[PDB]
Design a protein around this ligand. Structure first.
Ligand SMILES: Cc1cc(CN)cc(C)c1-c1ncn(C)c1-c1ccncc1
Length: 121
């Protein structure tokens, strides 16, 4: 366990670029971390965006969020070619980054109060 509830992280999921997230407790399992069916550690995260979403993400696809300018360093981990990004996706990402930048200025306790999602059955 490297991350706790309220920690700001970048998550790399599916076809999406490294995305600003907050580690949170799964609403049903009541854990923020688990070992998956393949025996690997996963973290439960909230995606910062105008579209609220959550996911279990493999620990290898999670990085500590130190700031928005870290994005270049993440692309450099893959090792000049640059992938373009769609305008709609870039816009949601900019909203996510804006929230992440405000969250980074808060303590872990303030982030949890401000951003933890409300789940409705
Ligand atoms: C986890 C997840 C679930 C659902 C619902 N089926 C839809 C999407 C797009 C996603 C997602 N996966 C990866 N990212 C980055 C996101 C996401 C979430 C919020 N805003 C923008 C991108």
């Amino acid at each position: 366990v490297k991350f706790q509830v309220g920690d700001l992280v970048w998550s790399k999921v599916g076809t999406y670029p490294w995305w600003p997230c907050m580690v949170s407790s799964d609403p049903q399992l009541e854990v923020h971390t688990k070992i998956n069916t393949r025996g690997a550690r996963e973290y439960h995260v909230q995606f910062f965006s105008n579209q609220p979403e959550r996911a279990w993400v493999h620990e290898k696809r999670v990085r500590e969020y130190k700031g928005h300018k870290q994005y270049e360093e993440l692309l450099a981990e893959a090792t000049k070619i640059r992938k373009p990004r769609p305008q709609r996706e870039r816009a949601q990402w900019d909203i996510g980054i804006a929230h992440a930048e405000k969250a980074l200025k808060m303590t872990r306790e303030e982030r949890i109060e401000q951003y933890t999602f409300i789940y409705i059955d």
